[PDB]
Amino acid sequence: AFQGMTEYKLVVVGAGGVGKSALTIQLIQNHFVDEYDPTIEDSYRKQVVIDGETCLLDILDTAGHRDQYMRTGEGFLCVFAINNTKSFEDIHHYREQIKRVKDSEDVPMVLVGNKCDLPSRTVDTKQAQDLARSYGIPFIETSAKTRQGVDDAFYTLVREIRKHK
Amino acid sequence: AFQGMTEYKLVVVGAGGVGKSALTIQLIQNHFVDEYDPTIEDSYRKQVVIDGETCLLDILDTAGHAMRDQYMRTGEGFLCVFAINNTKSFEDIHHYREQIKRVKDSEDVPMVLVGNKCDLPSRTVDTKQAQDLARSYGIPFIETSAKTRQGVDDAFYTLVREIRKHKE
Amino acid sequence: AFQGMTEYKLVVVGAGGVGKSALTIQLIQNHFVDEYDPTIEDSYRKQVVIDGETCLLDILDTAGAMRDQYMRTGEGFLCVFAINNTKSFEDIHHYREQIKRVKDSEDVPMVLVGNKCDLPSRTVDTKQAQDLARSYGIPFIETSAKTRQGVDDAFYTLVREIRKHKE
Amino acid sequence: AFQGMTEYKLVVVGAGGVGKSALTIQLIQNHFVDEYDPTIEDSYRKQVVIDGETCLLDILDTAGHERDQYMRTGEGFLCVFAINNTKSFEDIHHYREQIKRVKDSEDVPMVLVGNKCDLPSRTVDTKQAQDLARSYGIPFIETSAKTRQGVDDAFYTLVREIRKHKEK
Amino acid sequence: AFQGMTEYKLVVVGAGGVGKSALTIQLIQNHFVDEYDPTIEDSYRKQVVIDGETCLLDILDTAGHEEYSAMRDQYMRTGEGFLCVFAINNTKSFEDIHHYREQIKRVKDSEDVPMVLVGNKCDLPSRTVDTKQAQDLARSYGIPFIETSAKTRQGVDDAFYTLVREIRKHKE
Amino acid sequence: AFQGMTEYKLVVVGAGGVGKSALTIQLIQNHFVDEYDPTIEDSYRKQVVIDGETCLLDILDTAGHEEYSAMRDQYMRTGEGFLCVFAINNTKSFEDIHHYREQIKRVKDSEDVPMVLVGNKCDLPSRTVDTKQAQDLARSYGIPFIETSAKTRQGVDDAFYTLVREIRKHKE
Ligand SMILES: Nc1nc2c(ncn2[C@@H]2O[C@H](COP(=O)(O)OP(=O)(O)NP(=O)(O)O)[C@@H](O)[C@H]2O)c(=O)[nH]1
Ligand SMILES: Nc1nc2c(ncn2[C@@H]2O[C@H](COP(=O)(O)OP(=O)(O)NP(=O)(O)O)[C@@H](O)[C@H]2O)c(=O)[nH]1
Ligand SMILES: Nc1nc2c(ncn2[C@@H]2O[C@H](COP(=O)(O)OP(=O)(O)NP(=O)(O)O)[C@@H](O)[C@H]2O)c(=O)[nH]1
Ligand SMILES: Nc1nc2c(ncn2[C@@H]2O[C@H](COP(=O)(O)OP(=O)(O)NP(=O)(O)O)[C@@H](O)[C@H]2O)c(=O)[nH]1
Ligand SMILES: Nc1nc2c(ncn2[C@@H]2O[C@H](COP(=O)(O)OP(=O)(O)NP(=O)(O)O)[C@@H](O)[C@H]2O)c(=O)[nH]1
Ligand SMILES: Nc1nc2c(ncn2[C@@H]2O[C@H](COP(=O)(O)OP(=O)(O)NP(=O)(O)O)[C@@H](O)[C@H]2O)c(=O)[nH]1
Ligand SMILES: COc1cc(-c2cccc3c2OCCO3)ccc1Nc1cccc(CN(C)C)c1
Ligand SMILES: COc1cc(-c2cccc3c2OCCO3)ccc1Nc1cccc(CN(C)C)c1
Ligand SMILES: COc1cc(-c2cccc3c2OCCO3)ccc1Nc1cccc(CN(C)C)c1
Ligand SMILES: COc1cc(-c2cccc3c2OCCO3)ccc1Nc1cccc(CN(C)C)c1
Ligand SMILES: [Mg+2]
Ligand SMILES: [Mg+2]
Ligand SMILES: [Mg+2]
Ligand SMILES: [Mg+2]
Ligand SMILES: [Mg+2]
Ligand SMILES: [Mg+2]
């Protein structure tokens, strides 16, 4: 018996202020949050259709500065801001922490370069694509403000989870 | 901030063979199950719109006969099911209602009375009797058939409305 | 890469006047057709969600070598009789045989449908129809195009049978 | 030019107690109302897809015994009788006449609805009702607000009749 | 008894040529109107789900400059919520916002009317109104501010959905 | 009797690398394709609601450069509407639009074919084709013009939905 639609547990990680909450809230509520209210832990849920399969996204929005939610997640959005080189260098640390806690090389993951609407770009697309090619994962540019790439990022993660299953 | 649609935990209880599973599967899959496969415990989930609110129904299908006390404490609302061709199942209703009230330590638990198999000609429980039982408990009564689908949506949607009323 | 929803080809067969068209029109338009207008061939399409998969049902409504054509094309068959017509129930065996010959296979996705279950003049017992279906290895469903009982179930069950046969 | 989905104003008329409200509430809420609470005037709204066109149904549920206002506003009328009440069937002629006078027209979109077709106490034969409907040039549908039989069909058929009357 | 989904009456106001119609048509039809066809009065309707509640938006698209003022006072009395739109490349339209807000407050005889400030045409390069200025104006009124572009669709849903949330808050 | 939703056959044409596949994939999967995988012929399908009518879009994604093919002329005769795509940073692709339009008119033997002009890659800073120029070209052909970006998703839905509206107009 089918017992209800497929459920995917997604976790959004990355440095303080890169736009993890803004991305998530733009997905769930179609709203851009302008304030910076630091997060402890928040949970969201949304039903969507991706490639003709109905599914339920459970989304965990994490704090910038834990082992529990890394063990629960099936897929991770690894977010940096394209105007903050430090947040991009930190990506390697988030990826390592996820791999240790799940004890696995092959974890579904997507690299997300957020704030692509800002004119102060310090991380080149080619650099981020290279980093992603080296990890074997997709890369997507987003803006929580304009909504560019937001759906794509979360839907691409879902496709990665499907492939890994 | 809204964090996702409202979730309702529904538990279907009643005697062996009244059609608890058949009702639930007819709601989830639009399928009538003809076989009688006795249930231990099964969990289902469905998104629906009731009175303009989108919600997620988590539905626990229970066995006819401490794991029991667990799900009674978790559930927010109960479908109490009997079969209209089985007078025993109708008399047992009062026992299920009492067990739920003891475990939740409450008089006012959201509940709906469901008289299933209303498509069968061998009726032994009168509608008026069942309506009286329900009036005495202060809860709605609905006749259903998992076979024809009559009243199935109504039963589960009415339960959700009862849960909403109890939360104001 | 996903390029659009999955499509399923369903064929409704059975004797004249059992309610093949009435069933189909009740599925597509939520309308009971009271008139009996005999069919040559009609095609319908509907999008639905079954078990969380969005799909497109292409439905061929048949008449009571153009016949061999649609048997080769269909992935699944609703075999319909009327519960008040014993002849239509005996004819089921003939439709099933013709389908198995044309597809050269024992295991073709199929559902047995006993229609007009709202009428009081029942001449085919449920148990008999269930036995026939158990012998063929296929599901049996009672329907009424008039009350709508079992209509969705019949078509959706057929789609599930097609899915099982494709794994 | 498109400003939002097409809107249809439907009016449900007929004698007291034939099930005008029960039909409407079964359409809107998937709920059978067992109590008889007489209506003054109630308004309902539902978005549906009929023949691939999205539309908004505005539905006016009327009182058995009261009017000219809502007959002028309506684009289509469900004329309801109960199949176990011969009087309600004879009254149909009066509702149809009143509608034709107020709209000053022979060709008003209309559907004849024989409700309570789940009851065994039938006093109006289907053939009689079909003849009445054939004489008026309108469809006839048997419904039960209890089992839900024919409910969607009645309202959707009325919408199709309104569409047909507008292409000229 | 529930009788059908909740209905919200939204009114889009602001100076001539700010993009009131373009915003509305982008919401209803997913179409950018490039032509500038001045509006008299137009009505639109759309069903949407916001925060899990299904609702029906009735949307009144108004004229920049009103011919006669009684027809203006009519729709201000009917509306439950107002999108107050200026164009970020037209400082005059931004200064006019204050006047639309005042007229609405007088006609509804209330300080706390559901309202959203909308800075439209944020895709254009000739920006003359700074974001910070508009945010300050909105903070002073106690209402949300959203940047939109009817062309790119940025912020369009957000503007209308945020207005509905403001109406809900005012009704509790 | 209604037998199922209306079906529209749409063909996407234009020079190599303008973003015909990227547009189509962004419509179907909400995904931006960054890689450039040249197309021979690909078929897509999507159900949408446009102006309250549910429809099924059958979409044929064509090759940039193809010598004469009879198999190519086949599907151009079957197609009911054409998206004519150029890239706003490639003046050659804009000049080629005239050639696609001529080929379509010859194969359909008709002046009045439903068609939409699409200027893609409007997110790039290397613009060489002005909006006004493209609007003038489109006004001369009697067809709509839409700026799109498969990357940002701007105008994507609008392009395909506008084509469907053009097909509807041509059928009345
Ligand atoms: N322009 C622009 N600003 C953005 C974008 N995403 C987030 N912001 C802004 O960046 C700031 C921080 O966003 P926030 O969502 O709180 O980031 P965070 O990763 O969740 N922070 P934390 O780890 O403390 O929870 C906010 O002021 C927000 O409005 C974007 O894509 N574009
Ligand atoms: N005619 C008819 N038969 C029904 C209906 N509902 C259930 N049945 C039949 O009655 C039997 C029991 O159904 P089932 O759901 O297994 O009962 P249950 O309450 O789940 N039993 P248990 O407690 O063992 O899990 C099955 O044979 C089923 O087909 C109905 O509404 N009408
Ligand atoms: N009472 C009742 N009548 C039905 C039912 N199904 C079909 N009918 C009636 O039976 C007649 C035959 O229905 P129809 O669908 O035309 O049968 P068919 O199998 O398509 N005939 P054919 O093979 O000629 O195309 C119609 O008058 C219809 O109203 C049902 O489930 N209940
Ligand atoms: N068995 C059966 N009972 C029905 C049906 N429809 C309505 N009833 C019952 O008949 C009674 C009257 O129903 P109601 O909807 O109030 O009729 P009404 O035409 O609206 N009355 P009024 O004109 O005063 O507003 C109620 O007790 C209702 O439960 C039906 O289709 N089947
Ligand atoms: N680039 C760009 N142009 C826009 C935007 N919004 C509107 N326009 C353009 O600005 C012009 C005015 O738009 P319109 O919606 O008619 O404005 P209005 O506020 O309704 N005018 P009126 O008050 O007379 O009815 C049109 O040419 C339109 O295309 C936008 O967000 N970006
Ligand atoms: N920046 C930007 N790049 C785009 C856009 N659309 C397409 N591209 C890029 O342009 C390249 C070509 O895209 P594609 O859709 O394959 O072009 P095509 O017209 O289908 N090519 P062909 O005719 O050979 O099949 C890709 O690398 C793609 O990422 C856009 O709107 N913006
Ligand atoms: C919070 O989770 C539930 C909670 C309930 C629920 C409802 C009511 C009472 C309960 C419940 O669960 C714990 C004990 O008490 C029911 C279902 C679920 N969940 C669910 C969703 C989809 C599929 C499945 C099937 N599993 C077994 C593979 C399950
Ligand atoms: C692949 O085509 C079909 C195939 C089938 C189909 C199903 C099963 C077997 C078949 C079939 O086709 C011919 C013979 O073999 C049924 C429907 C269709 N298609 C269809 C699509 C939209 C609208 C309509 C209605 N027409 C009359 C405009 C039809
Ligand atoms: C209740 O009526 C409305 C009310 C309002 C409305 C909203 C807000 C304020 C108002 C309003 O009406 C008049 C003055 O004040 C807006 C729309 C409508 N209705 C509407 C819906 C879809 C399409 C059309 C256009 N037709 C006639 C072609 C109309
Ligand atoms: C007849 O259907 C089409 C028609 C067209 C179409 C559109 C435009 C022009 C055409 C067309 O086809 C015939 C020649 O001219 C395009 C797509 C389709 N259909 C479609 C789309 C996606 C997937 C499938 C199943 N297979 C291919 C995996 C089918
Ligand atoms: Mg945060
Ligand atoms: Mg069970
Ligand atoms: Mg037929
Ligand atoms: Mg009433
Ligand atoms: Mg305007
Ligand atoms: Mg390509």
Side-chain angles (χ1 to χ4, degrees), chain B residues 2 5 49-55 161, chain E residues 2 4-5 49-52 54-55:
Chain B
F2 163 91
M5 61 271 250
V49 184
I50 297 164
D51 296 345
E53 191 200 81
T54 305
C55 36
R161 292 186 191 103
Chain E
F2 164 91
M5 58 248 160
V49 186
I50 297 165
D51 296 344
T54 300
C55 37

Side-chain angles (χ1 to χ4, degrees), chain D residues 74-123:
Chain D
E75 302 168 75
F77 299 82
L78 286 196
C79 294
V80 187
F81 69 99
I83 61 140
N84 69 340
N85 185 294
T86 299
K87 198 194 155 143
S88 71
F89 179 71
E90 282 162 32
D91 292 341
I92 284 303
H93 163 90
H94 299 301
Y95 290 101
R96 183 171 162 84
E97 286 300 303
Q98 191 170 245
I99 291 159
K100 291 195 322 190
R101 169 179 57 82
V102 173
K103 300 201 83 74
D104 212 319
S105 164
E106 309 297 293
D107 202 36
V108 178
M110 207 171 297
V111 173
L112 187 66
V113 180
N115 192 42
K116 315 202 186 181
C117 76
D118 61 286
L119 289 178
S121 44
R122 176 188 281 274
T123 75

